[PDB]
Amino acid sequence: ALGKLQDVVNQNAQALNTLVKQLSSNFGAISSVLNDILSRLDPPEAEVQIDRLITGRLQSLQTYVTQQLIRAAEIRASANLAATKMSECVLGQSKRVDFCGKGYHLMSFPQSAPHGVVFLHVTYVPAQEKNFTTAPAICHDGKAHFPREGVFVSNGTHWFVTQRNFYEPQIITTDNTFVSGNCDVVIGIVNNTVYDPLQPELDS
Amino acid sequence: TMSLGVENSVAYSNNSIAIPTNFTISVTTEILPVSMTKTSVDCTMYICGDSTECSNLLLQYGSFCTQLNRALTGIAVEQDKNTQEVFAQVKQIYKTPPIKDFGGFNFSQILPDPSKPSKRSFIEDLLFNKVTFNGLTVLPPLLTDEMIAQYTSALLAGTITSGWTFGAGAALQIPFAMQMAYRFNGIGVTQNVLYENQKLIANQFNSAIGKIQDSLSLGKLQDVVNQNAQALNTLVKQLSSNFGAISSVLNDILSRLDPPEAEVQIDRLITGRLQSLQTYVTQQLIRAAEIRASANLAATKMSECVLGQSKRVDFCGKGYHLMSFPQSAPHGVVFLHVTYVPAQEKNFTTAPAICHDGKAHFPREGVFVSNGTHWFVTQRNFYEPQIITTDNTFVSGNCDVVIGIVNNTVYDP
Amino acid sequence: GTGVLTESNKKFLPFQQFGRDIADTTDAVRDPQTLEILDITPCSFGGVSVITPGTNTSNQVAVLYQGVNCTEVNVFQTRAGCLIGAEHVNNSYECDIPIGAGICASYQTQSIIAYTMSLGVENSVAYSNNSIAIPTNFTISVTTEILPVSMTKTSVDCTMYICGD
Ligand SMILES: *[C@@H]1O[C@H](CO)[C@@H](O[C@@H]2O[C@H](CO)[C@@H](O)[C@H](O)[C@H]2NC(C)=O)[C@H](O)[C@H]1NC(C)=O
Ligand SMILES: *[C@@H]1O[C@H](CO)[C@@H](O[C@@H]2O[C@H](CO)[C@@H](O)[C@H](O)[C@H]2NC(C)=O)[C@H](O)[C@H]1NC(C)=O
Ligand SMILES: *[C@@H]1O[C@H](CO)[C@@H](O[C@@H]2O[C@H](CO)[C@@H](O)[C@H](O)[C@H]2NC(C)=O)[C@H](O)[C@H]1NC(C)=O
Ligand SMILES: *[C@@H]1O[C@H](CO)[C@@H](O[C@@H]2O[C@H](CO)[C@@H](O)[C@H](O)[C@H]2NC(C)=O)[C@H](O)[C@H]1NC(C)=O
Ligand SMILES: *[C@@H]1O[C@H](CO)[C@@H](O[C@@H]2O[C@H](CO)[C@@H](O)[C@H](O)[C@H]2NC(C)=O)[C@H](O)[C@H]1NC(C)=O
Ligand SMILES: *[C@@H]1O[C@H](CO)[C@@H](O)[C@H](O)[C@H]1NC(C)=O
Ligand SMILES: *[C@@H]1O[C@H](CO)[C@@H](O)[C@H](O)[C@H]1NC(C)=O
Ligand SMILES: *[C@@H]1O[C@H](CO)[C@@H](O)[C@H](O)[C@H]1NC(C)=O
Ligand SMILES: *[C@@H]1O[C@H](CO)[C@@H](O)[C@H](O)[C@H]1NC(C)=O
Ligand SMILES: *[C@@H]1O[C@H](CO)[C@@H](O)[C@H](O)[C@H]1NC(C)=O
Ligand SMILES: *[C@@H]1O[C@H](CO)[C@@H](O)[C@H](O)[C@H]1NC(C)=O
Ligand SMILES: *[C@@H]1O[C@H](CO)[C@@H](O)[C@H](O)[C@H]1NC(C)=O
């Protein structure tokens, strides 16, 4: 579960261990211990070997520092991404798909972790589906009616208007649909009746 | 001196608003690198090829060879991961339905062609045709181009038959005309615009696909390929340098000097070649970091541009983004972003509110525009004037407070 | 040199002798005893990769000689290289131990097998111009996303590291 953070810690430890171990390499010198070089050889001779050791160790240090700089750049990119998620995922809700966990994001909770941050993304995922017949619009009195919100469905006998992300059929009314054009334009319009809430009040 | 573009001046005034009366569906092609060549160099063979004495002398320097082999291997594994993140975002390999009655939209150019030896779509074929042994080897990518093609076709089939739903949960079939109605709702243009003009939109989209095909018929990807090839060729060529040694060829030095003497020459060559190798590895690490940023951007676009819809401006094409279609390409991904761009604007006189009986009415959605004699309320991204009524406007406050309120009548249904 | 000596299909011009390659390596040497324009090819080389399931599960392993013909080395040929010790199975599964070129290995019924990864199950969508699937229920799921943020604030006293007092 913690692969990403454990890999970071292991990489840093490996870098340090390699750097320390480099001290023992001869690098072409008679020995990897500086005092042994000083004692065994004369100063004029010892200078060459010590210079070779210094060259080797400086190259090793430079390699370590370059690796550290690159890895720190990668971690900075990760930290910028984490800060962006903290801002757009915890302190708010995000419309960005798959930015804040699979599904339609609801919220997040941050948690600290050694050298990292762990988000718990709470998301809403549709579960069960039913096949319905649908048509873009409904013509009632020669004028097309389109849903204000959600889509039209049919259970095989009657037409209803339901919100897009959750089945909750309701009677089609002039308060749920708006009129635009006539039946002669829309492709796939279907014939039905749109109930008028106002009519019964005036009839009685 | 460069022009910086054409000059323009907007006819701005405190009571003038331009409303678009027509629209164009434009498909733009955005190309992104995703992965690079998986190189691998054996430091021992590159530096001291087949020379036991040279290998022994190199051993002194310690773990330089090991950590170079670790860094290059890390780059290779990261490249495989980049491909995985960018493409393998669909749980289930969908396939397009046998009957392609997508509301008149013709996708045949982007969908796979079964007749080809590799199930790639026409655009993928054009893209593929567009882009073109001493210790160095190339490790083949984990996913062959055929599997990349399968993944892109699955993403595309889901985007066509299920919209964004397959991004959230199980792919929910939905007629393509209604899917575009949803997307038009997303950009703010009421859905009736789509149905009332489905044929025009379909023709515009098909023409856009044809134009993209003609345009393709790839600078960024070729740039990556050329840069990696250049780095490899430089690394290979460095082997010919003397670095102060009598001769670049190690074997000649071996048969030229006694072991004690040849030691100095071999040390000079080893330092030179090791420095060159370190330089190459650092350059590769940095360029691979750049490619990881590019591949992460590509994954983000795939997620928020294909599987969904973007409200982010200019992140997904230039315009009111409608949708996207992925396509593979050698070491990269090409997006066809379908966007809704208004055009054929017209000047109208505007006003922030309208007073009927001392009550100030404001539009629920859309703005008030007059053709000079009458006032109407119209959606902001299209010209659909409608009579001003209590249903289209909500009351608030009174006439005095607002600035620029004009007098009119609000019809009562 | 050490290589495979093979008569060159390319022929040196009568003056041409002892050519080199772009890499500066000896591409071909004209036959000294009897001019034959002999070419040199580096002997096959590659990387050995030990594909092994966790030792706790089993100690059985397979070997991948990368980018070498199986002849040069139960051997299975893959674009990645030659795979020795692994059984080739037509059935596809989810990639477990990636090998390359679409080939993945795993440990299953028990031995090590190599195969082509499936990429996931096939699911055709029942699309049609008047059919829609609208969810009737939902689920609230909590997923974990782990991000590195900082790395150890190391520092090195270069003078003391290089020189031991
Ligand atoms: C929906 O109803 C309308 C009328 O309410 C139908 O329109 C009829 O179409 C036929 C065939 O052209 C004409 O002969 C009739 O005169 C039309 N009716 C009217 C009132 O003009 C339409 O066909 C119906 N569609 C469906 C799918 O049931
Ligand atoms: C909106 O613009 C489109 C094209 O930008 C118009 O469609 C063109 O209409 C002309 C008629 O003036 C035809 O000659 C072209 O063949 C049409 N092109 C296409 C691609 O269909 C459309 O008429 C415009 N609509 C309005 C209301 O102005
Ligand atoms: C979708 O577009 C393709 C090409 O853009 C159409 O295929 C062409 O079909 C015509 C006959 O209808 C042939 O004469 C051409 O040679 C075909 N071209 C290619 C490249 O195959 C296809 O018919 C279109 N389909 C729809 C439904 O519009
Ligand atoms: C502004 O729009 C109104 C609304 O249609 C126009 O008034 C109509 O004009 C047409 C002729 O163009 C007449 O047939 C209608 O009887 C008019 N109806 C009403 C309610 O006035 C008006 O002409 C338009 N003015 C301009 C300058 O475009
Ligand atoms: C809009 O109409 C209102 C009344 O319907 C106008 O208010 C009048 O303002 C004048 C100038 O101060 C007063 O003398 C009147 O008594 C006001 N009318 C009423 C009913 O009190 C207002 O001026 C009109 N505005 C415009 C721009 O035409
Ligand atoms: C809808 O009908 C198709 C017909 O092939 C079927 O496969 C599918 O399972 C149905 N919907 C659901 C939710 O099962
Ligand atoms: C849907 O397509 C079928 C053919 O597959 C056709 O008979 C029917 O009229 C179409 N209906 C609509 C609304 O497009
Ligand atoms: C609006 O008026 C300005 C006045 O300069 C004119 O330039 C512009 O073309 C007009 N708008 C349209 C859509 O014609
Ligand atoms: C707009 O500005 C003009 C002056 O440029 C002024 O006469 C007019 O009253 C202003 N109208 C509104 C609604 O602000
Ligand atoms: C390997 O060698 C065999 C015969 O020795 C040959 O048939 C085959 O094509 C070779 N394959 C490769 C990849 O070199
Ligand atoms: C896979 O099936 C083919 C026939 O399609 C057969 O020739 C081959 O031997 C099978 N694989 C194995 C490992 O037997
Ligand atoms: C919805 O699903 C939950 C479990 O996921 C279940 O307890 C509940 O009864 C379901 N609701 C309906 C109406 O089936």
Tell me which residue of C22, C75, A61 sits closest to B133, measured CA to CA: C22
Interface check for C164 against chain A (CB to CB < 8 A): the answer is yes
| CA distances to A8, B102, B370, B409 from B374, in Å | 68, 41, 5, 10
Mutation pick from A48, A98, A106, A178 vs chain B, by most beta carbons of B within 10 Å, is: A98
The number of beta carbons lying within 10 Å of the beta carbon of residue C123 is 17
Please name the helix (run of DSSP H) or strand (run of DSSP E) that holds residue B220, with its range, or none. helix B219-237
Torsion sign across C-alpha atoms A10, B276, A76, B90: negative
Nearest to B169 among A25, A26, A126 (CB): A126
From the CB of B109, is ligand 3 less than 6 Å away? yes
Q: How far apart are CA B158 and CA C77, in angstroms?
A: 35
Q: How far apart are CA A110 and CA A120, in angstroms?
A: 6
| Amino acid letter, residue B298 | A
Where does B96-240 show beta strands of DSSP type E?
Answer: 136-138
Q: How far apart are CA A27 and CA C162, in angstroms?
A: 13
| CA distances to B45, B54, B157, B240, B310 from B259, in Å | 20, 10, 68, 22, 69
The closest ligand to the CA of B21 turns out to be 2
Residue C139's DSSP bridge partners are: A125
Method: cryo-EM
* C152/A115 CB distance under 8 A: yes
From the CB of A131, is ligand 6 less than 6 Å away? yes
Tokens of B164: 């964004």
Q: How far apart are CA A203 and CA A33, in angstroms?
A: 108
Tell me which residue of B82, B95, B85, B212 sits closest to B153, measured CA to CA: B95
From the CB of C137, is ligand 12 less than 6 Å away? yes
3 state SS of B87: helix
Which residues are CB-contacts of A112 (< 8 A; sequence separation ≥ 6)?
A: A118
Q: Do the Cβ atoms of A115 and A99 come closer than 8 Å? A: no
Q: Do the Cβ atoms of B309 and B186 come closer than 8 Å? A: yes
Residues of A in contact with B175 (CB under 8 A): 134, 188
Q: How far is the CA of C130 from the centre of ligand 6 (A)?
A: 13
Interface check for B265 against chain A (CB to CB < 8 A): the answer is no
The closest ligand to the CA of C115 turns out to be 11
| Crossing angle between the packed helical segments B64-87 and B145-162, to the nearest 10 degrees | 30
Q: Atom 13 (ligand 12): residue with closest C-alpha?
A: C137
Please name the helix (run of DSSP H) or strand (run of DSSP E) that holds residue A147, with its range, or none. strand A143-147
| Amino acid letter, residue B393 | T
Q: Atom 10 (ligand 10): residue with closest C-alpha?
A: C69
Tell me which residue of C147, C146, C65 sits closest to C100, measured CA to CA: C65
